[model samples]
Target: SRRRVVITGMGMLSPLGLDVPSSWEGILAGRSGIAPIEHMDLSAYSTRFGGSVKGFNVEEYLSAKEARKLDLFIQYGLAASFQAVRDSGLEVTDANRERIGVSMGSGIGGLTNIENNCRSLFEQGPRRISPFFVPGSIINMVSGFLSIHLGLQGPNYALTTAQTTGTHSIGMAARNIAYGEADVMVAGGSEMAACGLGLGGFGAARALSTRNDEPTRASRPWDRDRDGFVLSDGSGALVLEELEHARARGARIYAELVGFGMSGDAFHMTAPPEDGAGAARCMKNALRDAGLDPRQVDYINAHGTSTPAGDIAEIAAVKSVFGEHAHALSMSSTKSMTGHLLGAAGAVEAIFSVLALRDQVAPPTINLDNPDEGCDLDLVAHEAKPRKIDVALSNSFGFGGTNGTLVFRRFA
Candidate 1:
């Protein structure tokens, strides 16, 4: 039998807020986190808006010396991981440190740091580069730093599956515990790519919203006027432990990780398949993995990035997967509020999914003034709604056609 894994703690640092509670409250209140790019000079970029986390001081979470050596993404990851560790209330002493692990992922590791270091190298010389450049710019350093900070000596790794990174991380972590590899795992994703190159690259691919004048209304997932996803940055982490271990230790259980699924489109590097076959298969596979019927799912945190094809395809995939239950499930894209965190999107959305199950409230899909015909669904649009969600699924698809789905059921 597969071991049961449950989430005991959650943390988030997003454009919406610095922590999960505030972020969820903002989403419940129909607030949008998207704003103009102020972190860097984006005057040359056509798309000036993104979901940038504001008012975050790394010094508050990490030492000044440590903060100076890491990139924004790593800082976000470490800060959020610290929050998760505190929330979990797990004593990670040297004796039990080997039983704890960290599985954090990021889509783009340190674009900002890389850009700065490369510029310094070109403008000045190799000697002008900071000694921390490589360490800060590497993706796996997210888990590396967190493991050291928390003194977790068990499995520490990172995934970079574009948008699916977080979901993949959580799923893989759960698998590890289920297979008796570790007792607890810190799993999530973080991303910081709101800089010029981040926006410019996605904009160049026509994957970002150009609604510069109205930043708040730019990421209109499932809306008729939806142009494209709003690039965003943030981090989200969750503490997963084997059910028996958590219960034995008196750990608070938030939700059970019941299902996980992954697939590849093999159709395109950026575009999803026309019929949403890959996404549909992934969701179905997750349901099967969880041993749950389609109708058992109550809500879904969709991978609806508000892009033209992505939003439609994701909705189509939902319909194909849920069948008759499609009309019953409350599906929403919290990305409508937090914007697209790319690799971190899935992890952040998964956090929202678990909260929805716990609070009995489904967050809203903001900016949906006019619904698109192809993307029609009962997207908890405009405002948050109260619902008894027993099982919830979070979906994430990445640039290379990689897809991931995670199902979390209420821990009764």
Candidate 2:
């Protein structure tokens, strides 16, 4: 028989806060985490504001010597993973070491580090490069460092699917446990691409909001005035375990991860088809995997990145998938508060989805005033809604046409 997977613990580090509780409070309060870029110079940039992790000191999570060799993304990922492990209270003794694993990644790994090192190599010659450059900036290092630090010996790897990285990581981690490859898995995604090159690159693509006057109102998902998404730096993680294994350890269960679905648009590299057929198919697959009907879902943590096309497309997808029931269910974009975390969005939204189930409250989509055409669904805008959310789904669509959806059921 296939084992069931349940989420036991979670951790998050976002522009909203450095951990889950603080971030959740920010989400529930409908507060925005975006502001002007202060860490780097944006004097000549088009989009001068973003969501950045403020007051984060790497030494708090790791020794100064150990932290020096890692990039900010890896540091954030490891810090969040450590929080999840502690929250789970999973003992990693010699006997169970081989039964624990890690799955983590980033959409764009260490762009700032790469850009900085490349500049040094050009100006100061190859001899000036730091030895830890490659290992510290690569995508898979999060999984490597996490497993090494935590002494987890089971399957370990990282998957990068742009913004869908976290959802795919957590979904695959749950699959690993269900397939008996591990009893416990730590999975999530992290990103810190708010540097000069990172900002300039996304800005060059015209994928960022240019509302330099009001940073807090820039990420207005489904709002008529939204120009584009706001970039953010953060990491999120969750602990997944086989149901029997969790019960054996007397672990507190947050929610049952009952279904995961993935799909590709096969249409565009950075945009979805206006019909949102791919996203519709993805949600349908998740429903089938969970053995659920469209009407059964009660809430959704939307992947509403505040982009003009993306927001409209997601609404179309939801309406297409849920039909009349779409109006009955509560859906909101936490991205309205946290901005776009890119690869980390999926994992963070998944945590919010589970939290929605746990608290029976649907977090609000801030700055969603004057909902755009076709964005007329029950979006739970401006304020958190106390509702009956027995089942929740989180949606994430990435730049490469990759789409992922995860379904969670409240633990009985």
Assess candidate 2 and give its TM-score to the true structure. Answer: 0.99
lDDT, candidate 1, 1-412, per-residue tens:
6899999999899998999899988988999998888767777888988888889988878889988899999999888888888899899887789989999999988999998998999999999899989988899998999887779998989999998999999999999999989999999999998776788898798888898999999999989999888999999999999999899989999999999999998889999987899999999889999999899999999998998888889888988988878999999999889999988898899999999998999899988899988666789989999988999999999988999999999998
Alpha-carbon lDDT, every model: 0.91, 0.93
Global local distance difference test of model 2 = 0.93
Model 2, position 244, has a per-residue lDDT of 91
- Please provide TM-scores, in order, for all candidate models, with all chains considered together: 0.99, 0.99
* Candidate 1 segments exceeding 4 Å error: none
Worst 10 residues of 1 by lDDT: 37-46
